[PDB]
Structure formats: structure tokens, C-alpha cells
Symmetry: C3
Subunit: 263 residues, 3 copies
Amino acid sequence: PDPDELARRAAQVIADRTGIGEHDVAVVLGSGWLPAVAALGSPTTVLPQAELPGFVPPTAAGHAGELLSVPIGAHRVLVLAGRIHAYEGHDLRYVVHPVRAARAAGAQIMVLTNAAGGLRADLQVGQPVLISDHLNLTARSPLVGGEFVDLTDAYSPRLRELARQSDPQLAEGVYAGLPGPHYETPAEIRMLQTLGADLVGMSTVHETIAARAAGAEVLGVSLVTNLAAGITGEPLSHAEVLAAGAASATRMGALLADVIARF
Amino acid sequence: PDPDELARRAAQVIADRTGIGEHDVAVVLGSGWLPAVAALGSPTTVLPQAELPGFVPPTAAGHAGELLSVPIGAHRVLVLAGRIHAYEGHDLRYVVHPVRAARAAGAQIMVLTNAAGGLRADLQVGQPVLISDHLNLTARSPLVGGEFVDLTDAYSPRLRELARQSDPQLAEGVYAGLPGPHYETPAEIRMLQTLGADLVGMSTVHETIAARAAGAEVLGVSLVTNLAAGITGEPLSHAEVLAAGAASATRMGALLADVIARF
Amino acid sequence: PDPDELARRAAQVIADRTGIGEHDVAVVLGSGWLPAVAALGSPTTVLPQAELPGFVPPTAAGHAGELLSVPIGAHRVLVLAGRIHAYEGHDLRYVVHPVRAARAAGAQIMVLTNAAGGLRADLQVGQPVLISDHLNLTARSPLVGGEFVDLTDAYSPRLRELARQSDPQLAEGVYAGLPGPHYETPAEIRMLQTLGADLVGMSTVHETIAARAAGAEVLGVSLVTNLAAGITGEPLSHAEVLAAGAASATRMGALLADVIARF
Ligand code: HPA
Ligand code: HPA
Ligand code: HPA
């Protein structure tokens, strides 16, 4: 039950079931990014997350997602379809366990994807934005002892350059992670603008900190699924977030495959 | 024990005990606002909150307040005398249950009142200020699943206009909700000024988010009970907060009755 | 088990074991400040914190620190060697219990020391900085009822003047307390700069609020152990923090002894 022990055990199961000793990249799919899977490549192995140690919070029954093993270029990639966010009420160890288990299975790069509100003038709905840095505004950490991790270049600049070779149209921005699940007030958005954020969302920051803690590099990719509250007046809804996710799914899947191949 | 089930059950008790099928407005009284009750109108039914499902946190014995049924104009109003704030240590479901139960009893408008420190130059002690928007600075939410609520116009502009017809002297401002129960340092107040806040307090933000989630409109009213730490130098105390509440009680009760009548 | 009852009981043990009815000053040593003890003075009594009521969180076995009784000038000083921070996962009552117990043993002044990242241009590694005020950015409080404490001059200006008589080179600054244990991103540091912070760390804010709540004056002293993330590019590590602590230990111990003597 130490998160690191269940991570090791998950990796044993992954290697055993896939035949693959080392998956060197992993992908965590954001809200609304699920339809991008087909466009990533064809999975050779599909593992229910429930059949893997440490993925499911002990209580609250509910059909977790899948973990896919997908060849992308010269990489074997672990793709996380379905995830748990802090707003679900479970210990952060479940929010970040996929990262830790992927790391234990050999992932040296974590591609952490999300749905985000755009805060910056230039941003359009459907636009992918690389994460240059983050503001963790949750007052929490997935780390528990005296485990001090340096977050300078938490979002690898070189993976960034790598990504922009694949799509020179890729802007980058600072992502603010909030608890959710309520969206923000217009006043809260003006505040985030003041604090230096370009993107806003309810995930990612803990996955990033756990990745860094475990020694992996991180590429962060936001899909702008809406403009942030108050910027245009358009109402925010999860259905609208899923809808933007699904409209951009072939683009996102294709982008991720090209970038990952380039690693 | 689902908060929505205890809300429904509370509403059954309310309708049964008051004879009133639908209370279409509710009022949550702020710290120090208790003496305003007399001035709201005469209650036809008084219900100990302890006799209502879901109001009292299982543990920590202590004499909760009352829920009053009060005719105000063409409305039957549920008035909450006594409440629980997050600084008490209980699950947020108890902080917001009065809102949810009022909603289940038919309230389509929640008048959420509070005591606040004034951050903006123009503000005087004893002055009521409408809440135009809020900064939730608690890192928490009363919502728990994937329950995504849009907080654009969380504080109904039209209820605002409505209120100002009753008292054209009503300024409005952005309210920052903090955890408490310690008051703020002068440095924290300068920070809140930078973040765009006009008012500061230890309640309200969760009641507002739960209201919106449940489909009610919100009118937020702050009594400025003191200037925020560092602005004038005057020391902050709860006795001083209660004292300002009590000095302004007839004014506040009268204001609320007039505004509510106008709904 | 009320924190105040275990505080009283700890003070009974302290007075019994030291022979000293009243220790009028206490010192809480920061990360990396442990080697400063020798330079404070020679302890007359050394008490394992485990032998004192309320210091150790019920679970998670681990060798706590010591509480030392040290004559410094005309004062008997309680010196805390080893402490618990919020990032350890324990209830805040354990983070602040040393303050409360010291107060119950007669401490009217708490010298709260820490390791901090420097955010302001002028700051050098190894430099002690007095805390003029704080930003509590944890979304938490060590206070639990309706216990409202005014934090105006939480860091006694007069103790400040007192300290600067001992070392006229002492700059002062606003300290931001964050949860940790991950260090900050460069974007988070630019945000803290915007919010008015000069120093950043993972302790102190709760000890200060508990001190004030209990009626003690506070002197806050940060050792700048590194420049904050992104300011110079230098990587942050706990080993580097301990190393700066140890290099500055004789200076810090000597400074504290001189200042405390002057009280
Ligand atoms: O605007 C947003 N805010 C918070 N989370 C989100 N997830 C998608 N869009 C948003
Ligand atoms: O100044 C304040 N700060 C926080 N809460 C308050 N409640 C009344 N006044 C205040
Ligand atoms: O830079 C810092 N940030 C947070 N905590 C710290 N403790 C020492 N230095 C630091």
C-alpha cells in the first residue's frame, strides 16, 4: 500500500500482460480527449485499470477506464483512457498513480494532456497549447514526506521544441490548476490573468509534480475547449467541453502521435 | 445521506410543519445579522434546525439555530438564523445544506448575507454592499462529482438592479471568501486588493456555488463591519463585528424586507 | 486531548523536569538551523519531545526531536530542535503544539525561524531576514472554533527594532507560507512577487497565528538558503538548503543569542 509499492506492482502486471519490459513514454488523456485514442495508433494490449494495483480508490464503485499499450514510432506508449481528478474527493495518490505506475514501467516522458479555458487574447477554441509552466492553486501536493522536488523547467523546454517541430503553430502558455469542479467566476479569471496564467483547468498540476518527483520529463498539452468565464460572455458547460474535445479529437490524436514519434 | 436526499427530506418537513408547499425565497443571515430578524417580519413558524434532516454535523454537540418561515410581500421566505462556516471543521455539505434544503422547499432566490472587512477606499462601517462577484480563495468546493457549474453572473445582475431600486445608495463590490477563522494580515489585505477584491470575509462563496449548482439565483449582501486589516489601523475583533451587526440590524432587516418584497 | 489541555500538561512536565516555573522566550528552529543550537548557549535540561504530551502525532512512528531549556541572558528559553510541518500530513495541532506548550510554560515571545527562498533583488544566500509580515497561502488555519484572532502587527515591530539593535544589517521582508513539500515553479515565484512576497517557505504561518491566538509576541527570522525558483536559474535542493543552514549556523546561533539577551 505505499504508493511506490503499488506502482512497482502495476508495472509488473503491465510488463507481464503486454510482453513489453519498458514503455518509455506515457500519455494521460484530458477531459474530452478520449475520442483521440483511435488516432494515436492501434493498441496491442488493453488493460482495465481495475485489474491494475493502486489505480482504483478503495471505495466508490464505478467503472474506471483502460490502460492501452500502443506502438508509436520507436516507442511503446502507455495510454491512460479515464482518470481521476482531485474534485472526485479521493486521495491524490489516485490522481497521480497512473504517472507513478507508468514511470515504474519505464516511462521517461509523460505527455500530460487536458481541457482548459483560454485566458489570453490570442487563444481560440480547438487550439492546442503547450504548457510552458504552471500555477498550482490547489493548496495541495501529491508528495507527502520531506520529499522536496525542484520544479524549475517542470515542462521540459526541449520537449517543447520537439513538439513545435511537429506543429510550428503551437503557442505555449502558463496553466493554472484549480481544484474545481465548479468553473471560475469572471472576477476569478481577472485574478488569474493578474497572476500570470494563460490557461485554466482542474487537473494536471499534481501529475506534473509527481512526474518530476519520480524523475520523468513532462510535455504538457492543453486543448482550449472554451474561453475562460467573463472573457467573451459565452456560458461554460461540460457538454460544450466534451463537444470541443470530440471536434478536435482527430487533430489532437494525430498531433500527439507525430510528436511522440519525434521523441 | 446523499446531501440531495437529506435536502428533499428537510423540504418535506418544512412543507409539513409550515403548511406552505413552496417557499420561493430564502435568507441566510451573516455573522452579527441575527438581531435583523425582528425587522424582517413576524415568523409564522419557527423550526429548530436540529429537528430538520441534514442540518447538524453528526458529531460536536451544540445548540444549532432556527429556520423561520416569514411572509414578506407576496413571498413565503425561509430565514436561516444560525449557520455553520467552513472554519468550524465540518464537511462543506453542512455549510451549504440550508441552501440545498431551501431550494428543495421551492426557493428560487437565495439572499446570502455576511459580515465583511471593507478593502476599498469608499467603504464605511455599517454600510451594506451588494456582491457583484466573488473570489473563492478557500481551495475548496461544496460540489463533489463531475458536477460542473458555470459561475458567470453567479450574483444575478437583475436582483442587483432590484435591490438598488429599494436603496439607490447601494454600492457593489467583489467579495473574497477566505477559510478563516483568523483575520488577515495587512500584507494579505494588500494582496487581496491586487487580486481585485473590495470586501473580505469567511463565508458565502460555498453557499453561492451550491445555490447556482441547484438552479437558484443569488443576491449577495455584505455588511461592512470593519475596515480590513492595515487600512486604518483599527484592531479587528469579533465583538466589534457583532457590535456593528447589532447597530445596523434595524437598517439591514428593513432593507432586506423591502428588497425581498420587490422580487 | 483538547490541544490546550495537552499544552497545559506539557508545561507541567517542563516545569517539573527543568525546575523552571516560567520559560519567558521560546525558539522554534527552522529547516537546516539545527547546528545553530550549540551557538545559542548550553542547555541545562534536554527533553525528548516524545516524553511530552501532545507533541507526537498518534501514528507514523519516527524519532521526534528534543526540547531544550537554555539560559540566554536573563531568560530561560525553550528551544525546539525538530518540528513537524504541514507537508508531513498531520493535523495542524501538531505543527503548532510546540508554540502552545511554550506559551503554557510561560513564553511571552516566540522566535520563529525558518529556511526561505529569496524573492527580492537585494537578497543573498546566507542572509538572515526579519519577517515584517506574512502571506498565508495554505488555505488553512491552526485555529478551529469561532476563534477570531487579529493579525495586525503579527510580527511585533518592537521586537524588530530590538533585533536590528543587535545587527543593523538586518533587512526585513514579507514571508509567503506555502504547503510544500514540492518547491515552486518559476511562474509561481513571479506570482508571489506580484502578491508582495519577499521570501518563500513551507512553515511558520501557522506557528505565528497560533502564537498570536495564545497571546505571545512573535519575532520571525528567515535564513535565505537559496534564491527562489527562476530568479537565478540555480537548482533548488534540500541538501543545498541544509548546507546553507549549516554554513550559517554559527552566525544564526550567535545572532539569536544576542537578540534574545536584548529582550
Ligand atoms: O474554463 C475552465 N475552467 C476550469 N476547468 C476547465 N476545464 C475546461 N475548461 C475549463
Ligand atoms: O475583516 C474581515 N476579514 C475576514 N472575515 C471578516 N468578517 C468580518 N470582518 C472580516
Ligand atoms: O525556495 C523555497 N521554497 C519553498 N520552501 C523553501 N525552503 C527553503 N527554500 C525554499
